[PDB]
Design a protein around this ligand. Structure first.
Ligand SMILES: [Cl-]
Ligand SMILES: [Cl-]
Ligand SMILES: [Cl-]
Ligand SMILES: [Cl-]
Ligand SMILES: [Cl-]
Ligand SMILES: [Cl-]
Ligand SMILES: [Cl-]
Ligand code: NA
Ligand code: NA
Ligand code: NA
Ligand code: NA
Ligand code: NA
Ligand code: NA
Lengths: 311, 311, 311, 311, 311
C-alpha cells in the first residue's frame, strides 16, 4: 500500500477527532495522566471509490491491512498508545472514516506556582509525518471532539476539552511534520487541603504563640520546639505530593515563611528568659506584650503580601 | 466476515452475562478494582443454521476467526481486557454461544462520605457500537450473571452482583451505542478501624484531658502537645489510605474536630497558668473544674451531631 | 481439532501434576504468592494411536497446534498463566504426555488470627470445562506432583505440597467443570518479630512502669507519654505489614491491650500527683506501691488469657 | 535476506542519529532515565539501486521484512527498546534511509559527589555486531542528532545532546563490535533544596545554639535533643532520595558534620550544668560565653573547608 | 523439527556461555537481581551440513523457526527471559553458533548474617531437559563466559563471574535434565552505612550516657527516652532495607543490644532519683560514678564479643 495520489499538488488532509471516555491517574510528581479515548480519522482515497448502484452497497468496510492508513502518533506519550481499531468505513467518493479506541500515558508539564489553588492545561499532541510521495496535513473535525459526561479526574474539575484547529507544520529530519494540540483544561479541587494541611498547620502555629502568655521558659521551649517539629512533618508531607520545582509554590512560600515565625518565637522566648535571669523582668514583659500583637499582625500582613504576589 | 443480516429491520440482540471468578485489589486512592470473570455472549446468525437430523450433530464448534463476533467492550476499564476464548457453540437454528474468560482493572468512583462505615456500588459497563449494515443492542441473560461462592474482596463484604436489564441506547459519533450496567454492591468491613485508629485516637484525646486534674503547667503543656502530635500522626495515617475528596468524610470530620478540642485545651492550660501567676488561683480552679465536665460533654454532643449529619 | 470420542459414554480423564520449581513473593497485604512450576497433563486420544513396528518409533512428538489439547485453567490467578510448552509425547496406544513450564500470581486467602505465629494452606486450583461433545474430568498423577529441594519462600518454612486426589465436579453455566485442589502448607518464620517488634514493644512498656518508683509528675508524664508515642509507632509499623481483617489477630490483641495499660498508667500518674497536691501523699504512696505489683501481674495474666484464647 | 556485499573489502558504514522527543523519569536511586526518541539509520545497499530517469520514481518505500536491516542495539538499556518503524526510503544509488520511533529505560551511572549542586553526563550507547559476510561500523550523521525544544526533564536543566563521532570498535566473542556514545549533559535544579532541606536544617541547628544563652539544664536538654531528632528526620529524608554511594556526597558531608555540632553542644550543656551543681558557675559562664562565638565560627570555617574540598 | 541424530549413542552436547552486559536492581528484600546478557549456544546438527562450493557461502544464516534449537531455560527466574536472537550461524560440518541477548529477573538467596559487611554468590542456573529421541547435556565454553568492564551493580563490588564447568545431570519427572551453575561473586559497599546509620546511632547512644553526669531526673528521663525513640527510628529504617530472616544479622544484633543499654540506663536513672528522694545521695553517687565507666566498657566488650561471633 502507498499514500492516496494527489488530484493536483495538494497535501493530503487527515481530519481528526478525540473523544474522551476515561481520564484517570493525574500524577503531580510524574506530571502525567492516563487517558482512554476514541481517535477518529478521515481522509479521501480515490483508489477506493465505488458506484453505489453496481455495488449494491452504500458503504464498504475494510480491514486495516487491506487499505492505506496514515501513521498518526502522539508526541507527548511515555510509550506508543495501546489501540484497537473499532471501524473502517468507505463512502462512494472514497472518503475513509477510521475509528480506534486507545489508551495512553501522557506527559504534560504542570505549573505548581498557585498550588493547591492551581489550574492546568493538559495537552495531547497528535502528529503525522509527510512521505516522499506527498505532504500529509492534520485538521480538526469539531463534530468529533468531545468527552463523556461521566469523565471524572479524581481531585480535579474538568473545565473544557478543545482543539487548536490550526496545525503546527514544521520540518523534522528532512520531512515535514503536521502537529495538532488537543487541550484539556482542569482546575484543582483544593477543598481537602483546608482541613488536612492548612488548618492543622495554622493551629500548631497559634499554639506556639501561647508562649507569649507564659513566663515558664521550660514550657515555652516545649511549646515552640514541639510545634516546630509538627511543622517539619507537614512540610515533609506536602513535598512528598509535589515534584521539585525551580520556583516557589504558594504553599511552599507559606510553609517556608512559617519557619521564620518559629525562629523569631525561639529568639523571643530566649530573650525573655535571659532578661528575667538578669533581673530585668519589666523589660522582658514589654517584649512579650509587644510580641502578642506583632506576631499575629506580621503573620496577617505577610500572608496578604504573599497572596498578592501569587494571585 | 460481516454481521448477520436482518430478517425484517430489527436490531441484532446480543445477550450478555458476566460470572465473577475473582475480585481483588480494591484500591481506594485509585478508585479501581481488579476482576477475573467469564463473559458470555449469545446472538442469532442464520448463515450458521444447519439441519440436526441430517448432520447428526446437535452443536458445531467454531474458532473465533471462522465466524462473525460482535465487538463488545468495557467502558470503565484502564486498558482493554485480557481475554481468552473458552468456547464457541452453534445450535441448529444458528444461535451462537460465545464464552471467554477475562481479567480487567475497572475504574469505578467511590463515595467516601461515610468512611470507614461506607457501602459502594461498583460498576462494570458493557458496550457495543452499531455497524453500518445493522444496529446492535445488548440484553442480559440472568441465567448467565453471577459470582463464585469463594469470591472475596479483602476488607469488604460482597452483597450482590446484578445487572440493570434495560440497556442505555444512545448516539455517539454518529452511530448507535448500547450500554449495560453490571453492579457489584459491597460494604466495608469497618472492624479493624476500631482497635487500630478509632480507639487509639480516643485514648490519646482522653489522656490530654488529665491536664484538667493538674496544676503543673510544664506537665500540662507536655500532655497536650505530645498527644496533639500523636493525633497529627493518625490524621496523616488516615489520609494516606484515602484520595483527596471535594467533601468531608465522617472520619475526616471527627479528626478535624479533635484539633479544635486540642486547641481549646491549650487555651485552658494557658489561662489556668496565667491566673495562677497573677495570684488568682481560685478563679483558675473554677475554669479547670468547668473544663472537666465541659470537654467530655461537648465531645459527646458534637459526635452525636456529626453522626446525625452523616448517617 | 475436536476432543477424543468416547468408546462407551465415559468422561475424558485428564491426569495432572504440578512440580514447583520456584516459590516467591508471598504478599500478606495482597494475599498473593508467585509460582514457577511444571504442569503435566496426560489423556488417552485413540485417533493418535500407532503400531510401533509399522512406524519404526516407540514415541511420537507433536506441536501443540497439530493435536487436541484440553483447555486447563487456574481458578485463583490474577491473570492467565505465562506458559511455554516443553514437550508433547504420544505412546503407541494414544496416551498423550504434555509438559509445560508456567509462572503465575496466585490469590489465596490467609488466616492472620495467630500472626506472626501462623501457618497457612496455599491453594492452586486447576480447572477444566467440558465440551458439547464430551465431559472432561481431572485426576492427580501423584508420581508427577512435587517440588524442587531448593524451593524457598522468604520468611516461611515449606511443609508439604500435596493434591486432594478427588476433584470437585460441579455445574457452571450448564456445563460440567472439574476442579483440583493443590495445597502448599507453609508456616511463618516468626524469629525476626522477637528482636524487631515484640521485645522493643515490651521494653518501652516496662520503661513506662518506672513511673511507679517516681514522685516527679513532670518526669512521669514524660515517661508514659513518650513511650506511648513509641507504642503508636510500633502499632502503625505492624498494621503496614498486614491487611485489614474483620477479626482480631494475636499481635493486634496484644498491641490493643498495651494501650489500656498506658491509659491506666496515665490515670495512676495523675491520681498520684493530685493527692500529693491535696496533701495526701501517704495515700498516693499506697496506690503507687500497689501499682508496682498490679501492673506486671495483670499484664502477665492478661497475656496468659490471650495466648490461651488464640492457641 | 543477507548483508550488502562489499565493492572492495570495506566495512559497511551505518550512519546513525538520535533525535530526543521526550526525556522523563530520571530516577536517582535507580540511576535510570526514560527516553522517547527517533533513531535514524542510513547505509548503502547496491542490490537495491535503480535508474532515476527510467523508473520515474525518485525514491522507493520498503517494508522492514522486504529488505536487509542492520541489527542495531542499545548497550545500557534495561530491556530491549519498544520500537515502531516510521519510514524506509531508498535513493537511486541504493542509499537506505531508515527511521524508527522508540522508547527505552536507560541505565546511566550518576556522580552524586556535589549533590544537590551536581551536573551529569547521561549516555546512550548504540551498538552493532559484525556478520561473517562483513564488518559493520557505525557513524554519526550530525544533521540527524538533536532534541525537541519542549524536552524537559523535571528537576533538571538540559545543556546539550551530542555524539562522540568516533566509534569504539572492539572484538567481543570473536566478532567485531562498533559502539557509539550519545551524551546528554544535564545540571540539577538545586533551587527547591534551599527552602525545603538546607534552610530548615540550618534553622533547627541555630535553635540548638540558643542553649548558649540559657542556664536552665532541663530546657537546654529539650532544645538540643529535640532539634537533633529533627536533624535525624532530615538525614533520613535526604538518604531516601539517594542511592548508597561508596563516597561522601556534599550534602551527606554537611549532614554528618552537623551531628558533631549537636554532640559537642550536648557536652557543653552537660559541662555547664555539672559546674553549676559543683558551685563553679563563673567557670561554666566562661565556657558558655566562649561557645556563643566558637560554635558559629567553627561552623562557618568547617563549611568553607567542605565547599573548598567539594567544588 | 526434531533433534540431531546420534552418530553412535552419545548425548547431544550444547556448549553454553553467558556474557554480562548489565547488572542492576539487586533487591535485598526480594532477593532478586536483574541481568542483561548474551547467551551463546553451540551444537552439531549434521542435517544442516552444506558444501560452500555449491551454496556459494562459507557460513549459512538461519531464522530460529527454520532449524532445530535446544530448549534452554533458566531455573531461578521470575518469568521466562526476554530474549532476542542476534545470530544463528551454521558452518559446513553442521556446527550451529547461536547468539541471543536476554534480560531476566533472577531469584538468588542472600546470606544477611554479616550485613552490611556481607559478600554474596549470585547464581544463574541454565537448564535443558532431554527428549525421547535423545539425551541433551550442557557444557561451558570458557572463551564465551565473561562480563563487560563497565558492569556496575549500585552499592556492590563485582568480584568474579565464573561457571562451574561440570553440569548437574539428574532425573526429573521420568526424563534427564542437565543443569549449569553460573556464579557472580559480589561484596557489599558498606561505606555509606557508617555516616548514615552506624555513627548517628552511636552518637545518640553516647548522648544518653551524659545522664551519668546529671543529678536532674527530669533532664535524665528526657535524655534517655528521646535518644531511645531516635534508636527505634534507626531500627525501623534498617529493617525496611532488609527481609525478615530466621537468624540474627550483625546489624540486627548491635541494634537489639543497644536497647538493653537504654533499658539499663533507665533503671540507673530511676535508682539514682529514688535514692536521692530517700536521702541516700552518697550511694546514688557511687552507682552513677560506676555507670560512667561500666556503660562504655561493657559496650566495647559486648561489641568485641559480637564481632568475634559474626566474623
Ligand atoms: Cl502514539
Ligand atoms: Cl474492553
Ligand atoms: Cl490460567
Ligand atoms: Cl452441581
Ligand atoms: Cl455438561
Ligand atoms: Cl535495544
Ligand atoms: Cl528462561
Ligand atoms: Na496500511
Ligand atoms: Na470474527
Ligand atoms: Na490444540
Ligand atoms: Na531485515
Ligand atoms: Na520536658
Ligand atoms: Na527450532
Amino acid at each position: 500500500v502507498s499514500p492516496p495520489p494527489p488530484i493536483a499538488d495538494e497535501p493530503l488532509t487527515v481530519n481528526t477527532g478525540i473523544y474522551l471516555i476515561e481520564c484517570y491517574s493525574l500524577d503531580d510528581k510524574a506530571e502525567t495522566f492516563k487517558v482512554n479515548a476514541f481517535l477518529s480519522l478521515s481522509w479521501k482515497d480515490r483508489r477506493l471509490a465505488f458506484d453505489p448502484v453496481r455495488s449494491g452497497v452504500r458503504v464498504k468496510t475494510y480491514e486495516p491491512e487491506a487499505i492505506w492508513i496514515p501513521e498518526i502518533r502522539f508526541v507527548n506519550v511515555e510509550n506508543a498508545r495501546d489501540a484497537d481499531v473499532v471501524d473502517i468505513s468507505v463512502s462512494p467518493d472514497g472518503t475513509v472514516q477510521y475509528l480506534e479506541r486507545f489508551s495512553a500515558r501522557v506527559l504534560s508539564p504542570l505549573d505548581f506556582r498557585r498550588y493547591p489553588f492551581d489550574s492546568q492545561t493538559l495537552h495531547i499532541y497528535l502528529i503525522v509525518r509527510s512521505v516522499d510521495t506527498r505532504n500529509i496535513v492534520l485538521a480538526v473535525d469539531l463534530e468529533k471532539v468531545g468527552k463523556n459526561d461521566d469523565v471524572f479526574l479524581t481531585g480535579w474539575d474538568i473545565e473544557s476539552f478543545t482543539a487548536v484547529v490550526k496545525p503546527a507544520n514544521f520540518a523534522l529530519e528532512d520531512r515535514l511534520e503536521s502537529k495538532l494540540d488537543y487541550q484539556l483544561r482542569i482546575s484543582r479541587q483544593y477543598f481537602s487541603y483546608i482541613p488536612n494541611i492548612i488548618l492543622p498547620m495554622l493551629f500548631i502555629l497559634f499554639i506556639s504563640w501561647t508562649a507569649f502568655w507564659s513566663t515558664s521558659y521550660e514550657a515555652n521551649v516545649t511549646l515552640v520546639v514541639s510545634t516546630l517539629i509538627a511543622h517539619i512533618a507537614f512540610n515533609i508531607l506536602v513535598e512528598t505530593n509535589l515534584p521539585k520545582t525551580p520556583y516557589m509554590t504558594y504553599t511552599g512560600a507559606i510553609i517556608f515563611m512559617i519557619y521564620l515565625f518559629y525562629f523569631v518565637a525561639v529568639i523571643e522566648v530566649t530573650v525573655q528568659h535571659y532578661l528575667k535571669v538578669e533581673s530585668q523582668p519589666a523589660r522582658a514583659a514589654s517584649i512579650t506584650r509587644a510580641s502578642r500583637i506583632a506576631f499575629p499582625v506580621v503573620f496577617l500582613l505577610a500572608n496578604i503580601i504573599l497572596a498578592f504576589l501569587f494571585f
